[PDB]
Write an enzyme that holds these catalytic residues in place. Structure first.
Site, PDB file in Angstrom:
ATOM      1  N   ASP A 171       0.818  -1.224   0.000  1.00  0.00           N
ATOM      2  CA  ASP A 171       0.000   0.000   0.000  1.00  0.00           C
ATOM      3  C   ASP A 171       0.852   1.275   0.000  1.00  0.00           C
ATOM      4  O   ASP A 171       0.541   2.244  -0.712  1.00  0.00           O
ATOM      5  CB  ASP A 171      -0.945  -0.014   1.205  1.00  0.00           C
ATOM      6  N   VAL A 172       1.936   1.310   0.788  1.00  0.00           N
ATOM      7  CA  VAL A 172       2.816   2.474   0.794  1.00  0.00           C
ATOM      8  C   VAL A 172       3.506   2.654  -0.556  1.00  0.00           C
ATOM      9  O   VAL A 172       3.644   3.782  -1.053  1.00  0.00           O
ATOM     10  CB  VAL A 172       3.845   2.363   1.936  1.00  0.00           C
ATOM     11  N   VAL A 173       3.970   1.566  -1.157  1.00  0.00           N
ATOM     12  CA  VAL A 173       4.629   1.646  -2.458  1.00  0.00           C
ATOM     13  C   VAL A 173       3.649   2.110  -3.550  1.00  0.00           C
ATOM     14  O   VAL A 173       4.021   2.881  -4.434  1.00  0.00           O
ATOM     15  CB  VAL A 173       5.275   0.291  -2.770  1.00  0.00           C
ATOM     16  N   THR A 174       2.410   1.618  -3.532  1.00  0.00           N
ATOM     17  CA  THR A 174       1.369   2.144  -4.423  1.00  0.00           C
ATOM     18  C   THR A 174       1.283   3.662  -4.330  1.00  0.00           C
ATOM     19  O   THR A 174       1.322   4.378  -5.345  1.00  0.00           O
ATOM     20  CB  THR A 174       0.025   1.514  -4.056  1.00  0.00           C
ATOM     21  N   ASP A 205       5.303   0.329 -11.073  1.00  0.00           N
ATOM     22  CA  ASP A 205       4.059  -0.261 -10.635  1.00  0.00           C
ATOM     23  C   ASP A 205       4.067  -1.789 -10.668  1.00  0.00           C
ATOM     24  O   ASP A 205       3.096  -2.390 -10.221  1.00  0.00           O
ATOM     25  CB  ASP A 205       2.941   0.289 -11.508  1.00  0.00           C
ATOM     26  N   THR A 229      -4.694  -7.603  -1.030  1.00  0.00           N
ATOM     27  CA  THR A 229      -5.859  -7.354  -0.193  1.00  0.00           C
ATOM     28  C   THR A 229      -6.921  -6.624  -1.010  1.00  0.00           C
ATOM     29  O   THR A 229      -6.627  -5.999  -2.033  1.00  0.00           O
ATOM     30  CB  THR A 229      -5.511  -6.515   1.029  1.00  0.00           C
ATOM     31  N   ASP A 233      -5.131   0.609  -5.379  1.00  0.00           N
ATOM     32  CA  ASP A 233      -4.365   0.582  -6.600  1.00  0.00           C
ATOM     33  C   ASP A 233      -5.189   1.130  -7.764  1.00  0.00           C
ATOM     34  O   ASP A 233      -4.688   1.915  -8.577  1.00  0.00           O
ATOM     35  CB  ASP A 233      -3.904  -0.839  -6.859  1.00  0.00           C
ATOM     36  N   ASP A 249      -4.676   4.635 -10.015  1.00  0.00           N
ATOM     37  CA  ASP A 249      -4.703   4.659 -11.476  1.00  0.00           C
ATOM     38  C   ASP A 249      -5.543   5.830 -11.999  1.00  0.00           C
ATOM     39  O   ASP A 249      -5.159   6.493 -12.967  1.00  0.00           O
ATOM     40  CB  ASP A 249      -5.255   3.324 -12.022  1.00  0.00           C
TER      41      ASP A 249
HETATM   42 MG    MG Z   1       1.359  -2.401  -9.586  1.00  0.00          MG
HETATM   43 MG    MG Z   2      -3.553  -0.657 -11.024  1.00  0.00          MG
END
Ligand code: MG
Ligand code: MG
Ligand code: FQT
Ligand code: FQT
Ligand code: OLB
Ligand code: OLB
Ligand code: OLB
Ligand code: MG
Ligand code: MG
EC number: 2.7.8.-
Lengths: 196, 199
Positions: A17-20, A54, A68, A75, A79
């Site tokens: 989640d943090v990397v997203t 990504d 999750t 995510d 986008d």
């Molecule tokens: Mg990704």
């Molecule tokens: Mg996506």
């Protein structure tokens, strides 16, 4: 390649989640900094870079035992934010530097339809129907607008009209996709049964 | 209700369906927004948009009189809301960018345009996964009240107050950004939201 990087990020306590969020923030900052300045080739390269980036959040999620539902929603939401920033950034250059009002119209169609295309799919699934497919999904969207932008500002062999070609092709194809996706909703099992 | 129901039965009797009425009202609302707002007729535009807010009660009334709503109709009505909202902000953007030439207010307007779509998306996408993603400060009724009151007051007959457009857009921009965070927090706290699953 992504697997050892993903593991190294998990190892220092980063979560998918943090990397997203971090990748989305960087992409948005890149688009809103570079496109309004007219640095469309650089902007396209930065956006593509974070498309590659990504791959890491999904890889991180798979390694630690799975994604999750929140992560999937986050995510997909990111986008939309990312797509929005790309078109807003380009709009700023087109509106205030190119001063090209017809192209602004195409850009605004692309901006709204990008959001609407994704919305139809999510809203259909929320009702247990299908609303995917059609000409323009996120990969086609990004290929078209970033190639138009990049070619229009390409080193040494730029072709400025490429930006307009891409935006108008995307606008037309995106309107068609809205209709296609709604038709997919309409044909889904259960879609037209009355519910009192 | 005592007014929408007779009207709705009338439209059904004429042969219109709820879905056709959804599409017609949205086309008219889009046409109004994209004609009137770019010309700077912001009060008339806000009146037309408000009229079609009232008009959007009819397709739901028709569906109920026919014996029930449909899932397609629910998706269609929600999708047309995104399209209508998009047209409102694009129409206002045109006036703000090219006639007021007010670049900070363009930024607020773009934030409102994107967040109007993202706020709605979080709810739909959460539900698609069996989570919840509603609530927060700015939902569609608040969004319309703020932006159309700002637009209408800025161009009000007799006693216009032009800054109202900017006030409304900046308040909506801030509150909308907050709403995106609120809604994602609601997703995160939904039962099952952080259980791991195969992708
Ligand atoms: Mg990704
Ligand atoms: Mg996506
Ligand atoms: C398309 O345009 O994308 C770009 C990219 C794919 O990126 P992606 O779609 O995000 O893929 P992902 O592997 O991250 O899987 C997402 C799924 O994983 C789960 N997640 C994700 C995230 C969180 N936080 N929590 C989760 O649980 C969740 O289930 C979610 O849906 O392809 C490329 O790099 C092409 C590069 C070529 C450049 C020249
Ligand atoms: C009063 O002014 O408020 C108006 C009100 C109208 O909103 P609406 O969403 O249009 O409500 P509806 O009564 O049409 O019920 C929708 C449900 O009916 C079913 N439908 C609908 C349509 C079709 N085709 N087929 C169906 O089956 C389906 O179940 C669907 O979900 O809110 C707004 O306009 C928001 C702004 C408020 C600003 C004060
Ligand atoms: C999809 C719905 C919104 C798409 C965006 C469409 C914007 C068109 C617009 O505002 O143009 C008006 C000017 O041409 C008036 O001179
Ligand atoms: C994938 C689709 C990408 C969309 C748009 C990118 C357009 C770039 C396409 C590149 C074609 C270049 C071209 O034809 O230029 C020659 C001119 O000088 C003739 O007058
Ligand atoms: C929500 C985020 C979506 C984008 C909304 C914000 C768009 C801002 C912008 O492009 O500014 C350009 C600079 O002012 C450079 O002069
Ligand atoms: Mg309705
Ligand atoms: Mg609606």
């Amino acid at each position: 390649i992504t697997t050892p990087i993903a593991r190294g990020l998990l190892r220092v306590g980063l979560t998918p989640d943090v990397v997203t969020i971090l990748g989305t923030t960087a992409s948005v900052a890149g688009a809103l900094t570079l496109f309004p300045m007219g640095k469309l080739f650089a902007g396209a390269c930065v956006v593509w870079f974070f498309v590659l980036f990504d791959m890491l959040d999904g890889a991180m999620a798979r390694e630690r035992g799975g994604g999750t539902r929140f992560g999937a929603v986050l995510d997909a939401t990111c986008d939309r934010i990312s797509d929005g920033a790309v078109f807003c950034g380009l709009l700023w250059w087109i509106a205030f530097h190119m001063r090209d009002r017809p192209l602004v119209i195409a850009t605004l169609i692309c901006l709204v339809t990008s959001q609407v295309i994704s919305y139809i799919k999510a809203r259909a699934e929320a009702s247990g129907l299908r609303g995917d497919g059609g000409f323009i999904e996120r990969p086609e969207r990004l290929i078209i607008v970033l190639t138009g932008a990049g070619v229009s500002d390409f080193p040494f062999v730029p072709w400025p009209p490429a930006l307009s070609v891409g935006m108008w092709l995307l606008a037309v194809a995106s309107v068609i996709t809205c209709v296609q996706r709604l038709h997919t909703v309409w044909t889904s099992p259960g879609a037209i049964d009355r519910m009192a």
